[PDB]
Amino acid sequence: AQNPNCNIMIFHPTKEEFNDFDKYIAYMESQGAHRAGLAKIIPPKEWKARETYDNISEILIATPLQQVASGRAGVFTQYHKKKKAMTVGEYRHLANSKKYQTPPHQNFEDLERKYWKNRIYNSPIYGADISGSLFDENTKQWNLGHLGTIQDLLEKECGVVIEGVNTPYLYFGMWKTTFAWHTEDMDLYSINYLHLGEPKTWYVVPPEHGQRLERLARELFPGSSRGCGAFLRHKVALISPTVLKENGIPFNRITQEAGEFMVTFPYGYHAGFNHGFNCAEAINFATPRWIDYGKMASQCSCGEARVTFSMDAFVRILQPERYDLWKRGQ
Amino acid sequence: AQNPNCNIMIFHPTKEEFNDFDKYIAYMESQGAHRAGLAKIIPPKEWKARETYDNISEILIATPLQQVASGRAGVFTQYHKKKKAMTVGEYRHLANSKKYQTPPHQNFEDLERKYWKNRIYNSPIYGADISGSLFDENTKQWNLGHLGTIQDLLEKECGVVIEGVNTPYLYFGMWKTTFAWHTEDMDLYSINYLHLGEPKTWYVVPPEHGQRLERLARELFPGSSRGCGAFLRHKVALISPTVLKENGIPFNRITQEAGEFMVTFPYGYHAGFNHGFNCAEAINFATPRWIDYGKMASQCSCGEARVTFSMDAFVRILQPERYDLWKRGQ
Numbered sequence: 142a143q144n145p146n147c148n149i150m151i152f153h154p155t156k157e158e159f160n161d162f163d164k165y166i167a168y169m170e171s172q173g174a175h176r177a178g179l180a181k182i183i184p185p186k187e188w189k190a191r192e193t194y195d196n197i198s199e200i201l202i203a204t205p206l207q208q209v210a211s212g213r214a215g216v217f218t219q220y221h222k223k224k225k226a227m228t229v230g231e232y233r234h235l236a237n238s239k240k241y242q243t244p245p246h247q248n249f250e251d252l253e254r255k256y257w258k259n260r261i262y263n264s265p266i267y268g269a270d271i272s273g274s275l276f277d278e279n280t281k282q283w284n285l286g287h288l289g290t291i292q293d294l295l296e297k298e299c300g301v302v303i304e305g306v307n308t309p310y311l312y313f314g315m316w317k318t319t320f321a322w323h324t325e326d327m328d329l330y331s332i333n334y335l336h337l338g339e340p341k342t343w344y345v346v347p348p349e350h351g352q353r354l355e356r357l358a359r360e361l362f363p364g365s366s367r368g369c370g371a372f373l374r375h376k377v378a379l380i381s382p383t384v385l386k387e388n389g390i391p392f393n394r395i396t397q398e399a400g401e402f403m404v405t406f407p408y409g410y411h412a413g414f415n416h417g418f419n420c421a422e423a424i425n426f427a428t429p430r431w432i433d434y435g436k437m438a439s440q441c442s443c444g445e446a447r448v449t450f451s452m453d454a455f456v457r458i459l460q461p462e463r464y465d466l467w468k469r470g471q
Numbered sequence: 472a473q474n475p476n477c478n479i480m481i482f483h484p485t486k487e488e489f490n491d492f493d494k495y496i497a498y499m500e501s502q503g504a505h506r507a508g509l510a511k512i513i514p515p516k517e518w519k520a521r522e523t524y525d526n527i528s529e530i531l532i533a534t535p536l537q538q539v540a541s542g543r544a545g546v547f548t549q550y551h552k553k554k555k556a557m558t559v560g561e562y563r564h565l566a567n568s569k570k571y572q573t574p575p576h577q578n579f580e581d582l583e584r585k586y587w588k589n590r591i592y593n594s595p596i597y598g599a600d601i602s603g604s605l606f607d608e609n610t611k612q613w614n615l616g617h618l619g620t621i622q623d624l625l626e627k628e629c630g631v632v633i634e635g636v637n638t639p640y641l642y643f644g645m646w647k648t649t650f651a652w653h654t655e656d657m658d659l660y661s662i663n664y665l666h667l668g669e670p671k672t673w674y675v676v677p678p679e680h681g682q683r684l685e686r687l688a689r690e691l692f693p694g695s696s697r698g699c700g701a702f703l704r705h706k707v708a709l710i711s712p713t714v715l716k717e718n719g720i721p722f723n724r725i726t727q728e729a730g731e732f733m734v735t736f737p738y739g740y741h742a743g744f745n746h747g748f749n750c751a752e753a754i755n756f757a758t759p760r761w762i763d764y765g766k767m768a769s770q771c772s773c774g775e776a777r778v779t780f781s782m783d784a785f786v787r788i789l790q791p792e793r794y795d796l797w798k799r800g801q
């Protein structure tokens with residue numbers, strides 16, 4: 142068994158190795174990368190996502206989300222309050238303002254301490270889930286807008302043609318903007334490229350221990366748990382590394398910097414925060430190894446969790462028994 | 472299963488919890504601490520090993536050992552060259568001299584980098600394995616000179632009375648002084664208290680993965696491996712964290728500071744280095760759970776490894792089949 146401690150692995154593909162996405166994901170897994178639930182990939186020195194980021198101020202964030210916290214410092218829920226549209230130029234200026242800017246800090250460790258101590262007392266604004274891409278059309282390797290689709294993977298493995306098209310999303314962040322504990326829709330993989338700006342810190346639980354996190358979550362958020370058997374799908378629940386330690390939940394942490402890829406693996410619970418103004422791009426993907434996770438994925442049928450048009454087909458084909466109840470749920 | 476990632480756990484016993492050594496070791500293990508191979512224990516704020524360290528300059532280091540390296544930066548062997556006796560006062564002055572002092576550095580991470588890059592190009596002097604204790608006679612808790620003996624544990628578990636008496640050892644360190652990869656004699660536990668001075672960085676492999684380290688060691692030190700089936704017992708072999716990563720060996724690292732205890736668990740391979748002038752005290756101990764490790768411990772019978780008077784009895788009772796060949800070995 143490779144990577145039995147489930148450590149987060151960091152990869153440095155050569156230009157040649159960076160030419161076949163599926164092959165390299167399979168290679169990473171042959172080294173046990175998936176057992177951590179998250180891997181970092183540093184692209185070849187000669188590679189670039191696009192020429193410059195000089196002309197991105199005019200992107201619209203149609204619905205910025207103010208992330209409002211309830212609970213205690215290390216155990217809280219966050220709800221998203223919709224705000225008026227703003228351009229990325231306006232957003233960046235807001236992120237850099239005295240009210241929202243990254244505070245003085247010694248290092249990543251000091252900033253993490255400040256995040257968990259102080260996060261709940263501020264309400265940062267997140268420009269999340271914006272359909273689009275910042276990869277140059279001519280970028281041929283690891284272009285998140287040119288990956289093979291989940292629908293084609295499911296067709297290749299199961300011999301069934303289905304509707305749907307999955308495309309990338311942009312995320313414009315500032316200090317304290319947060320992603321709550323979750324696995325991907327249908328326990329898919331995700332790939333995240335940090336285009337520019339300040340770092341993003343990640344926490345992850347190994348897939349083999351995901352049910353331990355779920356059990357702790359039910360204990361820590363009893364109301365939410367009664368409401369929905371898969372409430373973590375709502376992406377509202379935060380639990381600090383201190384609280385995870387106290388409860389013996391195995392986990393790992395790593396900081397992603399601009400120019401680096403992170404891949405999350407099937408059923409790898411993850412959460413994190415942004416250090417300051419930044420922009421990331423992400424998309425879900427699948428491999429043959431995902432199919433069995435897709436079949437076993439928990440579903441929110443309470444109506445809260447956002448269902449994409451594409452997920453109908455995944456549930457319909459992989460989870461026919463669950464399909465009706467899930468459908469009437471939302 | 473507690474601590475399935477085999478993370479090094481840090482404990483903060485209260486004064487009340489610090490009153491029963493065996494009980495607290497058992498508690499730590501009930502939380503899965505042993506799976507890492509190493510745990511840190513921070514004593515209660517009210518506890519002290521002794522009043523001051525003002526009067527320790529007159530301790531004699533009868534045989535200081537100059538640690539001379541051969542091999543490459545990340546894979547080397549060290550031999551111990553005997554030097555003339557010196558007092559701890561003289562040793563401390565040598566450790567603080569321009570030739571031997573800790574170099575300027577940003578943090579522990581920068582110093583670790585410097586250690587592994589530069590260790591082989593210098594020959595620091597180690598005052599190791601000095602029989603004695605710096606615990607005050609009146610220190611009633613976690614006094615390493617007042618622990619129950621291995622001989623009494625073996626008697627309590629196996630009903631056999633044996634000769635021998637195990638006592639503590641002092642270690643006077645300076646920058647770059649090194650302990651090579653090893654498990655304890657008879658795969659016993661050890662406890663190490665850092666009395667004073669600069670830190671000690673530890674690396675450890677989880678006991679469940681010890682044979683992976685051994686296999687890599689045989690590959691990296693082929694000559695030594697041919698010479699002795701348990702050559703790591705010689706305590707001469709160093710392998711850097713970079714090399715361990717490259718070869719997929721699961722391991723963890725932690726830095727011990729003055730006033731802190733480290734416990735190594737049965738068959739937990741460990742290695743490390745001192746940051747600067749310091750003084751540690753250590754002793755081996757046993758629990759009921761050790762007996763089965765004692766029975767399976769590998770032995771050096773090539774004559775190189777130092778056998779204590781006490782180990783005869785352990786091998787004689789726990790490994791009667793191996794006893795003859797081991798005895799003629801040394």
Ligand SMILES: O=C(CCCc1ccccc1)Nc1cnccc1C(=O)O
Nearest residue numbers: 221269270312319320321333375376421
């Ligand atoms: O889920 C999110 C943003 C939150 C989406 C959401 C949740 C609830 C309500 C509205 C929007 N973001 C990520 C997820 N997984 C990995 C990384 C991120 C990220 O923010 O870079």
Ligand SMILES: O=C(CCCc1ccccc1)Nc1cnccc1C(=O)O
Nearest residue numbers: 551599600642649650651663705706751
């Ligand atoms: O083994 C040693 C010192 C080397 C003993 C030795 C080896 C070979 C030849 C002479 C002396 N030291 C430790 C072992 N295990 C944990 C910690 C230490 C330590 O130096 O604090």
Ligand SMILES: [Fe+2]
Nearest residue numbers: 324325331405
């Ligand atoms: Fe995600």
Ligand SMILES: [Fe+2]
Nearest residue numbers: 654655661735
């Ligand atoms: Fe040791």
Ligand SMILES: [Zn+2]
Nearest residue numbers: 369441443445
């Ligand atoms: Zn729900």
Ligand SMILES: [Zn+2]
Nearest residue numbers: 699771773775
């Ligand atoms: Zn030997």
